[PDB]
Write a protein that binds this DNA or RNA. Structure first.
Ligand code: NA
Length: 497
RNA sequence: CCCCCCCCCCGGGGGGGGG
RNA sequence: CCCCCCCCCCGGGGGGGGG
């Protein structure tokens, strides 16, 4: 038996209804399968519930050849009568599109505008699905390779819709994953059991417990008390107490798309001025923030696309609007500015201490003659929308295709949404973005993505602060631990020595 | 229902090459 | 230890033929 301790923050049996760029769902990574997986810095489509695929010459039609003999979980709440087929695929994508499921808000898919990408998803055979596209999109299968594109049971959802019970789908799960849900208690624990009739090499550990109960501080406490074999997201100050010399535990870090940033509200006539935006950035000592907030578990970010992305062809050039308080003091002190800085009051994966950082920003800006008034704001209060002049947020993405993170944050389409906190719209940026998905080749795709990044770094719609590392601590008995920038953790590979 | 071919998938074992 | 080829075995699913 194995115990995985993590935060109760962001816990869901459905990453589809979850707010985008906030999590990597460790639970749905085990109980649900996608059609494909992408677990390499080359973005190779690993076949999962789809054995293979082919794209039409015009690029507007994708055909998916689904795996045979795949069965859904046999749980106390559901007992399947048939194998996985085209019907389960058709239901799952049509739900997120907003198309007919034929039964008695998806933040990620809304921000990437899936229904504007997909025309239709239809079953040709029980083991063949046809995807119609409005125009060629080289990002489609990468989005269907993401944590958000899990496949649900059509047989289960038909039975549930028969009694208005479709809410159960997210309370009592049924998937094809290597692990199965046994029992749980919300925000406390999840009890997983190995799926015996799995379509691939079976899970090595029969029983896994996902512990959500303990706080960030007492997580390493529970670990060293040996009631916890893998400890995820530990307290940042506690990391500097740990070592790589120990023969009883080891640490594993990973880089990826885990960005903390500051956005300018472009609904504020002052914030629409490039002069002040470039000066506010020059007033910020982002180097000093990395030590006080992250204690060497982060990189000062002068990029939007991580270096682990196939789209990173730029070797992160010097930032033109980096810390220089003298230039900042001149342009701002004489302007006599007072700005409302909002901070989302929640646990952030890209921010251990968001309010502490908001004080360091309030301090750095006062030196150059800018008055900052920080406000603790809730996620639904912001959704309701003195309005903010600056907001402190970020993005955590496993999908390293910049269509999945740069489009939600800076596109015109998402301007009046929670994803684009800058309320920015640049038709030249949307131009590069659109071009980057009409071309199928990496050379062509990375060129347009670097062009858009270069534009973002000069227009300054956001100030990138940190390149955050996701950390975990594991016991020496535990082998089969592989932390990747592409997703959460695969519990199938875990085993004791 | 049994026996035999072809195709795809999965798992295991063995030999060759690359980091 | 990971990734990839070749060979053999096993199991499952699908299509063709014989009793
Ligand atoms: Na918005």
């Amino acid at each position: 038996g194995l115990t995985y301790c993590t935060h109760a923050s962001g816990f869901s049996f459905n990453p589809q209804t979850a707010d985008a760029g906030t999590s990597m769902n460790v639970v749905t990574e085990q109980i649900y399968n996608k059609l494909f997986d992408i677990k390499n810095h080359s973005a190779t489509l690993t076949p999962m519930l789809a054995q293979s695929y082919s794209i039409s010459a015009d690029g507007k039609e994708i055909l998916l050849n689904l795996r045979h003999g795949v069965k859904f979980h046999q749980t106390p709440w559901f007992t399947p009568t048939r194998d996985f087929n085209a019907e389960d695929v058709v239901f799952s994508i049509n739900r997120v599109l907003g198309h007919n499921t034929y039964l008695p808000r998806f933040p990620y898919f809304d921000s990437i505008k899936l229904n504007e990408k997909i025309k239709s998803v239809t079953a040709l055979s029980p083991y063949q699905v046809k995807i119609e596209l409005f125009a060629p999109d080289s990002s489609i299968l990468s989005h269907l390779a993401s944590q958000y594109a899990i496949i649900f049971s059509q047989e289960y959802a038909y039975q549930l819709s028969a009694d208005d019970n479709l809410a159960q789908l997210d309370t009592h799960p049924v998937g094809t994953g290597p692990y199965q849900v046994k029992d749980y208690v919300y925000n406390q624990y999840v009890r997983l059991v190995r799926n015996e009739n799995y379509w691939k090499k079976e899970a090595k550990i029969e029983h896994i417990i996902v512990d959500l109960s303990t706080d960030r501080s007492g997580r390493l406490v529970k670990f060293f008390n040996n009631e916890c074999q893998i400890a995820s997201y530990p307290e940042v100050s506690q990391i500097g107490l740990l070592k790589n010399d120990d023969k009883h535990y080891y640490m594993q870090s990973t880089d990826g798309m885990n960005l903390a940033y500051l956005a300018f509200n472009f609904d504020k006539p002052l914030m629409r001025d490039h002069e002040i935006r470039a000066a506010i950035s020059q007033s910020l000592n982002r180097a000093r923030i990395i030590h006080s907030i992250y204690h060497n578990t982060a990189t000062v970010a002068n990029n939007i696309i991580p270096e682990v992305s196939w789209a990173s062809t730029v070797n992160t050039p010097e930032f033109e609007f980096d810390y220089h308080p003298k230039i900042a003091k001149n342009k701002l002190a004489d302007k006599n500015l007072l700005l409302n800085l909002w901070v989302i009051n929640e646990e952030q994966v890209y921010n251990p201490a968001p309010f502490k950082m908001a004080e360091m920003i309030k301090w750095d800006l006062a030196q150059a003659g800018v008055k900052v008034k920080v406000r603790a704001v809730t996620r639904p209060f912001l959704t309701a929308q003195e309005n903010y002049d600056l907001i402190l947020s970020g993005w955590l993405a496993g999908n390293l295709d910049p269509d999945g993170f740069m489009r939600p944050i800076l596109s015109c389409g998402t301007k009046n949404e929670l994803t684009n906190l800058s309320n920015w719209c640049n038709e030249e940026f949307d131009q590069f973005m659109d071009r980057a998905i009409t071309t199928s080749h990496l050379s062509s795709r990375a060129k347009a993505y670097n062009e858009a990044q270069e534009l973002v770094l000069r227009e300054l719609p956001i100030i990138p602060i940190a390149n955050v590392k996701r950390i975990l601590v594991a016991n020496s008995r535990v082998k089969g631990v592989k932390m990747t920038p592409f997703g959460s953790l695969d519990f199938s590979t875990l085993y004791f020595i």
